[PDB]
Amino acid sequence: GKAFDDGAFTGIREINLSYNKETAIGDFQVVYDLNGSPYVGQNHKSFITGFTPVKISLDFPSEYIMEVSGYTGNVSGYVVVRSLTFKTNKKTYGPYGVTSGTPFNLPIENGLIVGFKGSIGYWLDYFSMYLSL
Amino acid sequence: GKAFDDGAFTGIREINLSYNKETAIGDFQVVYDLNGSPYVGQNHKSFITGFTPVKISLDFPSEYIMEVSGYTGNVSGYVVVRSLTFKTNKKTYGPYGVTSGTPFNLPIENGLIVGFKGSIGYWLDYFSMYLSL
Amino acid sequence: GKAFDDGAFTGIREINLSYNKETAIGDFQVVYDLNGSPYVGQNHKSFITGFTPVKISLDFPSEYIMEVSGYTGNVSGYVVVRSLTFKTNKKTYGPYGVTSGTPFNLPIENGLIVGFKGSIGYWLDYFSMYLSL
């Protein structure tokens, strides 16, 4: 897929993603905080279309992500991120996608996700997170 | 004076300031780096005019600031920043403004200036710096 | 089990753990670096005996952990850390324990593991890692 790297910001205001029940996660876009003002991240889009869009609007700054989890698995010969869930201090958003294959999870005891990077082809192939205090 | 606070960024690409040798530092604006791109900070302008402009254009990311120094003192009954100097790993820019009053200096052995905040009236009343790895 | 929290240090020099090929991880102890000196962490001991010890001696500071992974699962009805593997920039240590149950992994693209905390009863109950630049 096409690699992407948003870099690091002050925090997260909203996450927009899309998914399909038959396949995996499609598109991914974040509205970050940057020094108290919203910063609209690049929209990382799949090469294909037909996904169901989801908007996770966080009540920034009191609401923040404390755990990101998901599943990876094979779709049409590609190993991709099939499912995502985002747990905040307030509630759980997800799972979105297909909860099949190998799980992963990153809980945070102290600190904040302040950015995302990864790669998207037909689906989200993989991703990493910037962490800061 | 009017307070400003640019917040924190990934680095510094250019500083545009102005000064008058009869008085003090006037305008102050910074192009920061934000995750690889120029971020054009707001121009924090003196309430008056008559200042000489200075453009400090850094060879980013090769070149970065290693020391910020200057002088504060009374101008017309107000304590203001009278002079500034920026030393990088490549050369020295300044002093800008008269080198009179009480010196200050912040050398950095490890780390980066990544943001500015302060207050400007007729002159730069005070400032602070964000530091990061 | 008994909670432990080593805190944060400058790096890791050695990890001394024990495990059982038929159950989970037992004892855990770390020699950290603290500003260039070894810091001998407390040995966090299982409530039981019968484990095989392992000494993971890293070539500090040139060798460092890039990924911690493993498995959590049921042993005698308790969710425990069943297995651990440490991959450094030089080699892979493990798996130690039983490679069964729910996988987890913490790969690091940038930064360093500088401390561990957790709990140990008959087996390692859960753990967390301090990360820093």
Partner: peptide, 14 residues
């Protein structure tokens, strides 16, 4: 360099 650093964990997925 002049570029600020941050901890990065992952990737997950592949």
């Amino acid at each position: 360099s002049g570029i600020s650093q941050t901890v990065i964990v992952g990737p997950w997925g592949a």
